[PDB]
């Protein structure tokens, strides 16, 4: 079913533009290959975690500009491009300005109205 | 609940080791008091460093 193994062209088929495939090592990759065998093997082995008491930066992003009505925790995947604040340098600016969708989806009713017209005339 | 605390407190006293024995001249002392002004005397600057140890 959906768990059927995949190919690198099939891999390039799913994800959108602008991402790179990485090996860090050949060795960590060999860890990933033994990982299957070691998912059984190293889970049966010594392991644990602990914490120490010690005194103590914290970045994060909502959607800031002026207002930008709120993003559900999932919708980030769609609207992530709006989160980054890089601005003012073509088509990428049309997709970027097209996030007025977000204003249609979530927001106050007036934002939905005005947004709706603005996208109609565009 | 508070009254149950009173009960834990009484039987807590009565379960102490040799608590009531006056044979050798032992002496028990109950002391009740308040901190008087406690809220009002907390120092904010200090309270900040004290909270930095916690959270």
């Amino acid at each position: 079913e959906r768990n059927r193994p995949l190919s690198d062209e099939e891999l390039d088929a799913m994800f959108p533009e602008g991402y790179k495939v990485l090996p860090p090592p050949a060795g960590y990759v060999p860890i990933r290959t033994p990982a299957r065998k070691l998912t059984a093997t190293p889970t049966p082995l010594g392991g644990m975690t602990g914490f120490h008491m010690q005194t103590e930066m914290k970045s994060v992003n909502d959607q800031p500009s002026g207002n930008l009505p709120f993003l559900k925790p999932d919708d980030i995947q769609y609207f992530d491009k709006l989160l980054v604040d890089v601005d003012e340098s073509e088509e990428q600016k049309e997709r970027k300005i097209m996030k007025l969708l977000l204003k249609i989806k979530n927001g106050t009713p007036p934002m939905r109205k005005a947004a709706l017209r603005q996208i109609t005339d565009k | 609940p508070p009254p149950l605390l009173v009960y834990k407190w009484c039987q807590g006293i009565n379960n102490l080791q040799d608590v009531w024995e006056t044979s050798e001249g032992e002496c028990n002392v109950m002391l009740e008091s308040r901190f008087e002004k406690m809220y009002e005397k907390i120092d904010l600057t200090l309270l900040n460093r004290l909270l930095r140890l916690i959270v």
Binding site: H52, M53, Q54, T55 | R49, R52
Partner: protein, 46 residues
């Protein structure tokens, strides 16, 4: 502020101390257990 800086530093030092004293113990335990196992296998051979 001074007390906080020096204090954090001191507790940190004490931390690396406790860790350093801990790892030696762990390795001693693993070596001990491995010895018990090797002795067990030897008792299995004879």
């Amino acid at each position: 502020y001074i007390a906080d800086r020096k204090a954090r530093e001191a507790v940190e030092m004490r931390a690396q101390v406790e860790r350093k004293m801990a790892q030696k113990e762990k390795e001693k335990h693993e070596e001990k257990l491995r010895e018990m196992a090797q002795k067990a296998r030897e008792r299995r051979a004879g």
